[PDB]
């Protein structure tokens, strides 16, 4: 009864739904930011520009959801 029906929780598979939305990679979930609009996950280092730390502010919006 997998948590993610898309990848079936298969650690061998990339998944842009339950892992990094940009690269699909599963590593470093402690460095994957959650977007406060779409609730997808983004490695800090997959962003443009890449970030070296988790932002301090409570609310963060991914490139797909943020104001331009």
């Amino acid at each position: 009864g997998p948590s993610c029906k898309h990848c079936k929780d298969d650690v061998n598979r990339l998944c842009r739904v339950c892992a990094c939305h940009l690269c699909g990679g599963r590593q470093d979930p402690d460095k994957q930011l959650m977007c406060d609009e779409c609730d997808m996950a983004f490695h800090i280092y997959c962003l443009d520009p890449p970030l070296s730390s988790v932002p301090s502010e409570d609310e963060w919006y991914c490139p797909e959801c943020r104001n331009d």
Partner: peptide, 9 residues
């Protein structure tokens, strides 16, 4: 901001 998970220091 929120992260997907946390990790031990």
């Amino acid at each position: 901001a929120r992260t997907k998970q946390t990790a031990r220091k």
